[PDB]
Amino acid sequence: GHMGITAIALYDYQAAGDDEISFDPDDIITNIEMIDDGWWRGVCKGRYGLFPANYVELRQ
């Protein structure tokens, strides 16, 4: 496994810019970079970019 820090989406998010990602509830976000306290970066469904940290739940 090379998925890094992962999280499960709690809410639907639609990317609002070419540097953001989108996800639906229960999608998995992989290789998360907790780069800022509000916006994180990670990989979801083939795209890498920013998303709201509080839209996901880190996997324990």
C-alpha atoms as one frame of an Amber mdcrd trajectory, in Angstrom:
protein
   0.000   0.000   0.000   1.223   3.468  -1.015  -1.900   5.511  -0.269  -0.374
   7.685   2.455  -2.796   9.484   4.747  -6.354   8.724   3.659  -9.767  10.087
   4.520 -13.390   9.386   3.675 -15.555  12.167   2.282 -18.442  13.152   4.541
 -20.100  15.676   2.200 -20.262  16.400  -1.511 -17.671  18.905  -2.714 -17.411
  20.380  -6.213 -14.105  21.843  -7.220 -14.361  25.626  -7.569 -11.089  26.000
  -9.467  -8.556  24.115 -11.536  -6.409  23.504  -8.420  -9.218  21.825  -6.424
 -10.681  18.311  -6.387 -14.253  17.002  -6.214 -15.768  14.138  -4.259 -19.059
  12.609  -3.227 -19.796  11.179   0.226 -17.925   7.910   0.867 -15.271   8.607
  -1.788 -11.723   8.081  -0.513  -9.078  10.807  -0.655  -5.520   9.479  -0.689
  -2.001  10.789  -0.070  -3.270  13.754   1.886  -1.022  16.737   2.532  -2.441
  18.603   5.515  -0.926  21.790   4.080  -3.119  24.349   5.849  -5.560  24.251
   8.725  -8.592  24.771   6.461  -7.600  23.458   3.032  -5.800  20.179   2.432
  -4.393  18.664  -0.747  -4.844  15.088  -1.861  -5.750  12.659  -4.615  -9.319
  11.697  -5.401 -10.659   9.972  -8.513  -7.618  10.732 -10.635  -7.137  14.398
  -9.648  -4.713  16.046  -7.219  -5.601  19.314  -5.544  -7.193  21.269  -2.738
 -10.326  20.513  -0.744 -11.912  21.571   2.571 -10.394  19.632   5.456 -13.665
  19.547   7.419 -15.447  17.777   4.533 -13.518  14.546   5.278 -12.819  12.174
   8.136  -9.247  10.902   8.494  -8.985   7.120   8.596  -7.597   5.720  11.845
